[PDB]
């Protein structure tokens, strides 16, 4: 139960189909289309990146970057706020 994960459980509810929509399109040319086939909610994409890509306690600049593209400072604020 990493710390960045316990925080992703709260911000994940604010994402909704809105965040999943933006981060999904940009994910095609960034994370991986095959990985999106399994992605379903917010904790899904966050579980894959943390697995082995670019996401960990003290290194979530990639995820927070995509949220910055959606222009969502209410959620993106909590992400970079954890540190």
For residues 79 and 4, what is the distance between their CA atoms, to the nearest angstrom? 8
Where b means 16+ CB within 10 Å and e means fewer, 2-19 reads eebbebbeebbeebeeeb
Task: Count Cβ atoms below 10 Å from residue 40 Cβ, excluding itself.
Answer: 10
Method of determination used here: NMR
**The domain containing residue 11 runs over which residues?**
1-83
Torsion over CA: 15, 55, 81, 67 (sign): negative
Tally of domains within the chain: 1
DSSP assignment string, the chain: --HHHHHHHHHHHHHHHHHHHHHHHHHHTTT-HHHHHH--SHHHHHHHHHHHTS-STT--HHHHHHHHHHT-HHHHHHHHHT-
For residues 83 and 45, what is the distance between their CA atoms, to the nearest angstrom? 20
Task: Read off the CATH number of the domain in which 55 is found.
Answer: 1.10.533.10
């Amino acid at each position: 139960m990493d710390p960045f994960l316990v925080l992703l459980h709260s911000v994940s509810s604010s994402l909704s189909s809105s965040e999943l929509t933006e981060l999904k399109g940009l994910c095609l040319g960034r994370v991986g289309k095959r990985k999106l086939e399994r992605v379903q909610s917010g904790l899904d994409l966050f579980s894959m990146l943390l697995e082995q890509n670019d996401l960990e306690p003290g290194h979530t600049e990639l995820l927070r970057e995509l949220l910055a593209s959606l222009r969502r400072h209410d959620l993106l604020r909590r992400v970079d706020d954890f540190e």
